[PDB]
Amino acid sequence: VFLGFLGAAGSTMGAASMTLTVQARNLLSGTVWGIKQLQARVLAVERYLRDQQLLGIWGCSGKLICCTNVPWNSSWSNRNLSEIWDNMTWLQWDKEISNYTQIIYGLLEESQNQQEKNEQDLLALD
């Protein structure tokens, strides 16, 4: 089944995780009034590389999905595994964790691949 772009928006996070390769595909899409679209499509790739840079500096690079070595703090809306992926939408979820989104981002780019990759340089010399 292919609901299309933003298809599983009202679906659970677990269900919408199957439609990840759909919203990612149509995310980049390939005299005045003509400069209207130029300045817009320039911001389009800047918006793309911005997320890609974050996706790269973290322990991901490879898009879609990736795991990280960061313990989930209970203060970030303590829900259960079956209460998140099977009883909540991504829109509804992003509304709660929005307060801690900037906090989590810092624990991914700094605490991980700066300490993890440097750790690997010590493990690869032997």
Partner 1 sequence: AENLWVTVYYGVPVWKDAETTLFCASDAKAYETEKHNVWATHACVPTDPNPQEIHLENVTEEFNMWKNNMVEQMHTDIISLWDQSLKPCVKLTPLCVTLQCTNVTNNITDDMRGELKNCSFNMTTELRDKKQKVYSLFYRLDVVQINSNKEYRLINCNTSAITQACPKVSFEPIPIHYCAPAGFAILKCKDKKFNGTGPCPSVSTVQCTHGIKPVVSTQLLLNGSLAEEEVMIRSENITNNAKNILVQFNTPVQINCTRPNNNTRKSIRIGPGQAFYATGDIIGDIRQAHCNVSKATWNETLGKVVKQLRKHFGNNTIIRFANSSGGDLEVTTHSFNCGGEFFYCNTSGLFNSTWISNNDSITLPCRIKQIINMWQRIGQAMYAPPIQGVIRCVSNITGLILTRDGGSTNSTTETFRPGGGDMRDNWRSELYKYKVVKIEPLGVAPTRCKRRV
Ligand X SMILES: *[C@@H]1O[C@H](CO)[C@@H](O)[C@H](O)[C@H]1NC(C)=O
Interface ranges with ligand X (CB under 6 A): 73, 75, 96, 99
CA distance linking residue 108 with residue 21, whole number of Å: 23
In the complex, the smallest distance separating the C-beta of residue 31 from ligand X, rounded to whole angstroms, is: 37
Q: Which of 67, 90, 88 is nearest to 79 (CA)?
A: 88
64 binds a second copy (CB under 8 A): yes
Length of the chain equals: 126
Figure out which of the listed residues 33, 36, 39, 75 binds a second copy, where binding follows CB under 8 A.
39
CA distance linking residue 82 with residue 88, whole number of Å: 10
Figure out which of the listed residues 9, 42, 91, 97 binds a second copy, where binding follows CB under 8 A.
42
Figure out which of the listed residues 5, 6, 9, 41 binds a second copy, where binding follows CB under 8 A.
41
Whether 18 and 85 have beta carbons less than 8 Å apart is answered as no
Q: Give the other-Cβ count within 10 Å of 23's Cβ.
A: 16
Whether 16 and 89 have beta carbons less than 8 Å apart is answered as yes
The number of residues that bind partner 1 (CB under 8 A) is 67
Binding interface with a second copy (CB under 8 A): 17-18, 20-21, 24-25, 28, 30, 38-39, 41-42, 45-46, 48-50, 53, 56-57, 61-65, 67, 109-110, 113-114, 117-118, 120-121, 124
